[PDB]
Design a binder for this molecule. Structure first.
Ligand SMILES: NC(=O)c1ncn([C@@H]2O[C@H](COP(=O)(O)O)[C@@H](O)[C@H]2O)c1N/C=N\CC(=O)[C@H](O)[C@H](O)COP(=O)(O)O
Length: 244
């Protein structure tokens, strides 16, 4: 199957935004989150990667608006941000979303995370957001403010636990239009049979073709934010590119 494309809708105060390397001072904005989501659906999206960035940064919630978005969409939503306990996991799932991503809690609450992987299966994926410095692949939590440990040790543990899916970001590529980190993606994909979703850095249709070349190694899809919002290319171009 071709690479699945997931347009990102990253929500700050109800708006679709992007950041450069997850840093608040670099925020660009693209309208209402609901209009963004509906637009990508109109354009052909199979999936929306819907992120509550206020919740990821521990500074607020867009949960009600995200529930509205999920409810209005016909297509599948992968929902994340703030999903750190039983209450917030249930609230997320109660929206009717297809699945969630857990970030911080995989780092800080491994037992909880293992429990929810166990109970929820394919509805729970883990986001592995990686900052690589001098070869050290570190996970980042809490809106990428915190250190969450070594990627490979955590990946190994999650994989052992049965984690359904991993959503992998090179944080230093996220929002940069600098290209995906294909090394990191292949590295993760080669260490798990669980599907991997590539997130961050896409800058061109050729970047998507490049990620597509990894589908056989288990890279199932790619999340695309800035290239779409900035109108580097269109969704149908992208959908067509991954089938070249
Ligand atoms: N500081 C951040 O920006 C950030 N911090 C956490 N998350 C996510 O918050 C959730 C974890 O929350 P929690 O720990 O569980 O509360 C997880 O999903 C974290 O992965 C972020 N999402 C970043 N990009 C969002 C995205 O969708 C890009 O648009 C996409 O990579 C495309 O990038 P592009 O434009 O194409 O380069």
């Amino acid at each position: 199957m071709p690479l699945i494309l997931l347009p990102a809708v990253n929500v700050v105060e109800g708006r679709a935004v992007r950041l450069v390397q997850g840093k608040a001072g670099s925020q660009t904005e693209y309208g209402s989150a609901v209009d963004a989501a509906l637009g990508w659906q109109r354009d052909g999206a199979e999936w929306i990667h819907l992120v509550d960035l206020d919740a990821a940064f521990g500074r607020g919630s867009n949960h009600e608006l995200l529930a509205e978005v999920v409810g209005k969409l016909d297509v599948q939503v992968e929902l994340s941000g703030g999903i750190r306990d039983d209450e917030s996991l249930a609230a997320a799932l109660a929206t009717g979303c297809a699945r969630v991503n857990v970030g911080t809690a995989a780092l800080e609450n491994p037992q909880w995370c293992a429990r929810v992987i166990g109970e929820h299966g394919d509805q729970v994926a883990v986001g592995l957001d990686v900052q690589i410095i001098d070869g050290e692949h570190r996970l980042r939590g809490r809106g990428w403010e915190t250190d969450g440990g070594d990627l490979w040790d955590v990946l190994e543990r999650l994989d052992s636990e049965g984690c359904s899916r991993f959503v992998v970001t090179d944080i230093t590529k996220d929002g940069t239009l600098g290209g995906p980190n294909l090394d990191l993606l292949a590295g993760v994909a080669d260490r798990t049979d669980a599907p991997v979703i590539a997130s961050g850095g896409v800058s061109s249709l050729d970047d998507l073709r490049a990620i597509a070349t990894l589908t056989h190694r288990g890279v199932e899809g790619a999340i695309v934010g800035k290239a779409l919002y900035a109108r580097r290319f269109t969704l149908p171009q992208a959908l067509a590119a991954v089938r070249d």
